[PDB]
Design a protein around this ligand. Sequence first.
Ligand SMILES: OC[C@H]1O[C@@H](O)[C@H](O)[C@@H](O)[C@@H]1O
Ligand SMILES: [Ca+2]
Length: 555
Amino acid sequence: GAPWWKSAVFYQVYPRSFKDTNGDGIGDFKGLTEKLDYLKGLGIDAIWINPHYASPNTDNGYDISDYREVMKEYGTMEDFDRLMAELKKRGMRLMVDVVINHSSDQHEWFKSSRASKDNPYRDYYFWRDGKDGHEPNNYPSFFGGSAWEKDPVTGQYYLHYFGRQQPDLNWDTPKLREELYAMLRFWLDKGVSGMRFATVATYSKTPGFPDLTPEQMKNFAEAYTQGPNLHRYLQEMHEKVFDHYDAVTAGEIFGAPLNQVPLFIDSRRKELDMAFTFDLIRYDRALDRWHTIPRTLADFRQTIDKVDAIAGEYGWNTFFLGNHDNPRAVSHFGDDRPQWREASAKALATVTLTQRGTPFIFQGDELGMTNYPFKTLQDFDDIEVKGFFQDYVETGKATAEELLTNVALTSRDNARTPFQWDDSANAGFTTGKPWLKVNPNYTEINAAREIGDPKSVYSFYRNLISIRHETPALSTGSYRDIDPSNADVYAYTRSQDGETYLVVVNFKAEPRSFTLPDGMHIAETLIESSSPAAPAAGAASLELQPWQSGIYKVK
Ligand SMILES: OC[C@H]1O[C@@H](O)[C@H](O)[C@@H](O)[C@@H]1O
Ligand SMILES: [Ca+2]
């Protein structure tokens, strides 16, 4: 048999932007709880929530100052326990975000660590003498400037791959790893069903902190995933924690070459259960992470093909076209112009729900939400954009307008604008002023408008989730790309126990044709989007409308 997580459909909730119930403009636990009937109705089996722990929010939850307290903004431990209970009444499961590559610089461990070199917490972090009058080495940070920050209290620099207020935790220190395992046990003892591990591939650092080479410097994210003790630490965490619970684990494998992914997910290695990879979501992103390189569907499917292959026989992949760190799915992979937004959003839904692996739908994508129309750099909240400003504008490599032009298409903030519930003030997200502006298209794009409409993007996701739930080959069946070279129509099969399904999606806003492979004919049409008529039983070919998608049982 296959674990519940292999045939589950997950929904990712970014609490901060899902539903606010007290008018401070920030979503909270009570709002999410209020909306569980909505997600149950869509057909969601489990929810992954972004960090919900006490945090100064320099990186919206990913800078944790106390791993055993809930974030003040989201509510209390009681609201969290109530979220858990309400999910359970509905047979739903909760996956929480685990951030243990680093903590906030307000965590008590860090306040202690920085006091002196002999403090019992000194080695919970990485402290090192500067070199040749400057930092310990040339490591850059993802959020700007050096990954090393000098602390006058002792004269040494501490390590921070991410923000200056997100010091990296030292996994080479046994006592620190034991503190981390105990923390995990605290949440797992509360009944949590899954854990998503933030930047799980950077836990291990390189002994000696040598300078990155010129080449390594072009893609430093990759070098940070090459620590020598990485799998040893993940195997220990598994042996000491996960082997005693029934929780599914999912690693955010940020920066690692795809060839290394199996080391994290091969069930026999006893590390993680499934992977979140970045090969597809960043397939058209330049190395500097704020420019886009044009790509075709051929690149899209070939990437998916390579990723599916890495899961081999004992690994498992998650599948997603969107999350809180990337531009909106329909805007990024589809066509968000008014005339094609709904049609392309439905096509992308068909792709997402028929991929081999566990699908994660990001809040709002089921409604066809789009990127946001940023007008000035001041319209972004993201610390990452401030880091691009520091690294490229202040340095004269680019102008503020160039940064604006490009980052509008790639910013994480595109996925963080308030969820569009209805067409009331601020789309019903809040009675106050939203922490991030609501997209003006909320008047045409909102859940209340779509839930009662048989033809809406929402209803289409809902029917796809039902179809996937009733069709085993669609979750655990094999996957085969029919033609990796085709840049027009994405076609593939899913098979299991003699049943084979065909998925065909036109990625062009023009009619196209698709001829089934020799000896294959349509048997039944499960569903189609943007189609005036289902093909006839026995069809050897398909005529497709712009952005048409469909799932068919073949014979
Ligand atoms: O904490 C650093 C980063 O970790 C990633 O796992 C999260 O998805 C990002 O949102 C965050 O900025
Ligand atoms: Ca609130």
